[PDB]
Amino acid sequence: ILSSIWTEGLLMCLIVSALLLFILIVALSWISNLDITYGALEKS
Amino acid sequence: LCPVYAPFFGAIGCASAIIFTSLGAAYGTAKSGVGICATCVLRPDLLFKNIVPVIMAGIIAIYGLVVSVLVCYSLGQKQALYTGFIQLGAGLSVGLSGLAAGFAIGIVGDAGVRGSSQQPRLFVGMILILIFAEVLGLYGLIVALLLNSRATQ
Amino acid sequence: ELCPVYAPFFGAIGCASAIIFTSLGAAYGTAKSGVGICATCVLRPDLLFKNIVPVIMAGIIAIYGLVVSVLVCYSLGQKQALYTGFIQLGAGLSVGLSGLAAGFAIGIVGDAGVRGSSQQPRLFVGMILILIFAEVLGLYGLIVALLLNSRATQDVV
Amino acid sequence: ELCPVYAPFFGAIGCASAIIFTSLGAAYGTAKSGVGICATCVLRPDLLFKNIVPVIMAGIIAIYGLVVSVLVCYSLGQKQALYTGFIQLGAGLSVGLSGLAAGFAIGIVGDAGVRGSSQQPRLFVGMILILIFAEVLGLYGLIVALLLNSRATQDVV
Amino acid sequence: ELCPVYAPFFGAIGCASAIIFTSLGAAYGTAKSGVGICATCVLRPDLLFKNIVPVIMAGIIAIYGLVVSVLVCYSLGQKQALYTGFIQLGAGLSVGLSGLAAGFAIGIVGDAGVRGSSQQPRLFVGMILILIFAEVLGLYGLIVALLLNSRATQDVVC
Amino acid sequence: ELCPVYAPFFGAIGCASAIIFTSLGAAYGTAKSGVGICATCVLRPDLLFKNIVPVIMAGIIAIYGLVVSVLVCYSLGQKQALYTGFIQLGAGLSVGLSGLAAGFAIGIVGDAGVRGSSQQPRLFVGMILILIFAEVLGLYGLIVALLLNSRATQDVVC
Amino acid sequence: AGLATVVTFPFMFAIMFGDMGHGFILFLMALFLVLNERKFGAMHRDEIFDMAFTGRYVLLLMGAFSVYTGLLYNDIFSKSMTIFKSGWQWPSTFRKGESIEAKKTGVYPFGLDFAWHGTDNGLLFSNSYKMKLSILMGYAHMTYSFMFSYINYRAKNSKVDIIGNFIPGLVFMQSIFGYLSWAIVYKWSKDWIKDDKPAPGLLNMLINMFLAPGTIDDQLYSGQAKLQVVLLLAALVCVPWLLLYKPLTLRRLNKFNFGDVMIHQVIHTIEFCLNCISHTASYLRLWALSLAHAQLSSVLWDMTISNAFSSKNSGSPLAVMKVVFLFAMWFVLTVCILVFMEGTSAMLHALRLHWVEAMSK
Amino acid sequence: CCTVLSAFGVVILSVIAHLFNTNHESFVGSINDPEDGPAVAHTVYLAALVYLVFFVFCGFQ
Amino acid sequence: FSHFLYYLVLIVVIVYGLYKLFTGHGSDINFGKFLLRTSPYMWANLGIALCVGLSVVGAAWGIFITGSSMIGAGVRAPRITTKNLISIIFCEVVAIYGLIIAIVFSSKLTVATAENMYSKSNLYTGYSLFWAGITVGASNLICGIAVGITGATAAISDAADSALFVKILVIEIFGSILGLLGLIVGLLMAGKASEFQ
Amino acid sequence: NIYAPLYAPFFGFAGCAAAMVLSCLGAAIGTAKSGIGIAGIGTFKPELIMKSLIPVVMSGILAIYGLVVAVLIAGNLSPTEDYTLFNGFMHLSCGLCVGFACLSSGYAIGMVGDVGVRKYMHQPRLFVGIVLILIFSEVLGLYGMIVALILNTRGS
Amino acid sequence: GVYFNIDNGFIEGVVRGYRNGLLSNNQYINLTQCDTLEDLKLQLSSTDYGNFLSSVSSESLTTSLIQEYASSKLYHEFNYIRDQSSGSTRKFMDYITYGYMIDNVALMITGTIHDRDKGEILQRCHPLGWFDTLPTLSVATDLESLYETVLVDTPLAPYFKNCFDTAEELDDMNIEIIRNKLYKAYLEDFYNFVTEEIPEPAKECMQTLLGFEADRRSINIALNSLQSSDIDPDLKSDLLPNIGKLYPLATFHLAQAQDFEGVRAALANVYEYRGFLETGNLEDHFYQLEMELCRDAFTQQFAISTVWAWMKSKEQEVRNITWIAECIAQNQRERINNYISVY
Predict the structure, then answer these.
(1) Which chains share 3+ C-beta pairs under 8 angstroms with A?
(2) Which residues lie on this side of the membrane: Cytoplasmic (chain B)?
């Protein structure tokens, strides 16, 4: 057996849910860096 | 052969197929909608022809919705790891593809609707660029709908 | 084995995250597009009651989270299957992390739109049209979570 | 069981860490004070051997590590208790991460005092008076590790 | 048990560290002070072989690392005590991560000293004085590592 | 028990590291100095071949890594001792992470040296001397790894 | 190039947009503009409706071919048509809920067969059919538009351009992908079950034709191993010939920049030999978007009106307002997605298949 | 636009009700399909009449 | 804060490895048994999905890099906006590479019998499809970004002078070698891999 | 066989992927960063562009360096033959010592051959020195390919 | 260059398009062959200036109206590029205009000491350096009541850190000191902004373009202090910026430079500024070196320093057109080819 706590199925759920959470953190850091061009909305 | 943790991957694939696709569609709607709102304060008659990038970003989210619905009709309590990881792959494919296609449509769309108000010949240019970025969601949808057909065989 | 003891953990996280991340999305949509209302209704306050539509369409995302949180909450149990917990985790994340995106889009489009609608009054219809495409993202997440939650306890053992 | 095989690991890490972090603190305290000296006496080079006090007081807190990293080194055996390794690690960290703080304080006060003592001649007494409070930090860490190391092999079995 | 199979790992990464972390401090003391020589001797090139003392004192600590790496290398064996591996790791870290500090100090002091010794020539004897204190920080680590390495295989058994 | 099956992993990554980090340092030393060569030989075309000595000086670092990695490669075996893998890992790190240091030092010294040597012709000898003091770090790493690699397979058994 | 476009652009559209229901809707909303072209001509047209009315005859053909091809498929709002006699019969006596196969009686007369509709492995057969359909129609479109280059070089009276570009292009294209398109038809022609022979894989036949020549694991025809070597040599001899004929015979006729001709012919050779592979795999979007249209029209029907069909509460007001609301929700989703925001994508993909895959030969 | 949707609601639902009435195998022939044909045809034909009411009412607009 | 987590995970890995190694149980951190006992369908499906995902995130990356600068450079010179679309096309072909490799890989994805499930061949064809999906998706990612950068420079040098686009299209050709080389290597890696049996 | 376990092709296909991905990463950095400098001088003296395509060609050779070793690792991998863990570790190392070698060589070519091409529009005598520094920065990947070939022939 | 075109894709390609409208050497020779300001207008109408003087019609056309409208379209192009900017780019565009805000402050508070009317001392102000409380600098005389009333809400407020108001209100001698000290603190802050948040290809070629501004301002302060200033070097060293290539060794010798030779021997030790003070027009030497530093900032592609390198080159273009139109209107043609063209 691989382990009793860190079994064959838990340890490859925590790789899938680490890859997906990595893609999520990257995509949320893309959307967090999204700013509005305010000079093209004002009168000045 | 069909363990107890096997519908985790299918449920998280059904999750990610709409999550990453809606993140990409939200970036493609928001960033290209800033360009619509910035463009149409000095030339407002271009408002309903500049609406194409948010429509294409919505088509991306429809492509993700299709995969999420078609994955959640094949989930069961006692499915194999084969079905689970193939639903996971069908989720990841359309997730990364809709995310990439939505980022590309968002970054091309605001630049296109800004160049279209200065030069009128750039409307056909931005449409022909955004059609290449639209079908990348189709390129993930193909792998998602092919891995869906191999779910229970 | 089919119904373990740690199985309500994923169901409780799915009940929590559906309201947590939609409250984050609705909070960003209220916040970013309410700064624009408070900045552009110091000069033209006559259109204060029509700039409120980004805030309302942001607050619909929290109701999308609330419905799925109640429907996951009334399916939790002590001896539920691990399948039920996985489906409730997926339905919680499918509403939460999609309504977070919808709320980001509503906040960005609303702040960019209520600032440009005071200089050009014809941009309001375009703002509403873009915000409908931004709100159907959270609506699609609601559809995915309802189709999961109908599948949650159907043929469970 | 009381004296395992992996017991000299903590003593060797303590003997290294006693001199490693005091060398880092002394390096910071020498580096910033040397930049302050070499930038303050291109105009008044008569204060060259007068302003050497921050470099000396930063070099003393490395001798503070050199004392305890010899007194820990001469109590390292193959068959030593794990209690001895734990105390030698605590002593090495108590000198090291306190002399690192003392070196940070001496390095900031040193160049802040030698860049200003070229203007006011009686800021030198205040600079020494603040650097004494910055160097008793390393002295306190030395006292803590010398009280630890007098107990690492007192009543061990 | 008392001399396990993984016991030469700590001795090998103590032989390696005593030149790695020493040479990447000697490289800082060479580079950061050499950009201060090459930027100063464009106007005072007669001071070229006098301002190069920070580079020499940064090269001395790499020899301090080399001696300890050779003495840890020639005490490695296939069947050695784990105490010997711990002591050699401690000696390697004591040389490397303190010669890194001595190299940082020589690098920061040396370019500040050679850029200032061309405006005032009476700052060279102050640069040497600060730089001896900056350079003895690696000699202290060499003393600690040699006193460790003399204790490595003294009363080892099994 | 003493020559396990996973034992050539450490020798394999030691043979890899002596190319990886050494070519990374040599690439830094060629790139950052070639920026200065191409930036100063715009108005000083005749000094174009005197300024290659930082780039050649950084290429000798990659030659140092090449020699030690080939000499480790010709001692990897299937039924290899774990001591031998530990020694080859130490000898790979000792060349790689010291040639990276020497490459950092040559890359930061050499561009300032070719920028100052176009302005002052007597700074060239000082540049060459500082580059010798910077290359001797990677030479020290090669000395440590050649003295270390010669001890792999001396008294190995089982 | 807009004189072969007049049929091929609506037809390459219809291969991607294949349905008699959506095709009749698009034909009807095009024929509404064709019959009312006098009232709409003397009218101010905004840009979207000017685009839609300038092409009121591209959409009439795009509907008229979509009805034809969705009668070739059995796809009428993603349903089948039991018009002809089937080539498959199902067994009469079988247990409920078990997996059964059908026995082949004959072949279906016109179009695809309707016993593939509610079928587990029907989608595998539709994948094979539509992939090979896209390969053969892309081959036909490319070898039709490649003859126009020969007609151009013949009208310019340039035999140097013919022998330098057309012939080494023709016997490079036809010796690889003409052979693939022939091999698909020849595998369809043989039975492979009555003969008790293994059916060859055509992907790893073209993989092994370039890697391991002469080694045939599953024999597809007699004399395969020695004819594929001849075709491989005929394809490999035209990589130096198309690159070296024209510059070396323009240089010989000067006894003019030889660097501007040799580099241009190297770029032309690299581009053409790249594009012969890169376009026959790019015509598989005719299968991609057709699969997408068929599966979306299936899973919209199954979510909207498959829920409205129930034999309980027959004649009840709730059970008939259920059908009314679900038909309205189905129809607005078909019109909004599967016509306007799906056929526009099929239109643009049949457009880029002309702009790149056809207007570069 | 309600008259177009109502005309398609007449035509499509009338064809669907006729295909349920005649027990066509693309609508009844599966196990997941409804069992009784004319029971579904009776509630689809009334919806066809409802859309015909909408088509006649919006046809005089 | 991310550097704090990078240091914390490193400290936890070092403390766990040294605790597991000092107590004579250091072979319990067993990466080989982890590779032997995880399901090959994870590696296969993950390789297919990351192939078609990371080809598209490079294709879409290059599309916006040489699309936004094409539209910016086309404001004064609108005679580039159709000719220069081949720079969109060269960074778009790296997605069809990953697509036609993902479908060929998914053809090797059948149901293996449970008695021979963690066999030699079934585990081989999980490893091969995993790394041959990675080496195609990452290569098409990097190729799409490189072709997008060298097309964004070409879209501005085209608007500068018309005779420069022909000279800088060659850099896009040398940049688009890379995705085709990844296309070759990912087919050679899963060339001898059989189906799941 | 205890010397040839069934997880050994993991480290061989990892060697394939590390030999291809990092070498084409180095080749792409080397062609993109240098194409920036080549196109930057597109207006100022356009006649020096076709002469300056050498740091693009020498960057593209770094992908051939990874291609050769990726083919030679993938040719030693078969599900029917025995495959030792020694062979898998050796293929991991020979892909890993060519991937970062070509990555560093591509970073060096990209940083040298755009600054050189960008300063070459002022001084036309730079070109010999530019080509020389590109040769010294391109043999960095040749060293790693030599180590990878010797290591492949040793490990099999 | 991998993350540049997210927010700066459209911005660069239009500025790169604006670069192609820079007049080349042949387009300057075709302007020096003109005989009338009307012929120069019609020659500029074939360039990318086309029909910018269309509302003038040959009668009110002077050589200052050309400098007005040619710079006005520069300012409107800068505002169009700034309106499409967001994030760090928009902040970089604001930091460019801060140096014009400083000049408009120092030009507005000299029009009140001389009691010139407020409506005519504002048409001479710079349009890019506009802040909303710029006309309200005509309310007080001393520095403290102009800071604490007006200049606190301005973004020039962190730059009043060393301006010591000794309750002497204002002459013309200390407004130049306040101007130089505000520009000193501004050059410090904008160099730290470029070093901090601007990415690496647009960092090294912007630190040089900004250190050149600091070196030119240091030489101009240390050389204009000979004739119309009698100040101590300890008070003169607060006016010299410390970011440049010239600071740590040469601005010390420029601080105690009491004579012209104290400047010349100080600038003989620096390598790229030696020979400027020997022969020729010094202002032409600085403008030529400015254009040679702006030319090789267009040669790096994915950089936001192309905006700075564009607007300084376009300002030099407006200066060259103004010099030519001044030569062909006053009938002096002995130095008509004194323009500066690196494009």
Answers:
(1) B, C, I, K
(2) 29-50, 110-121
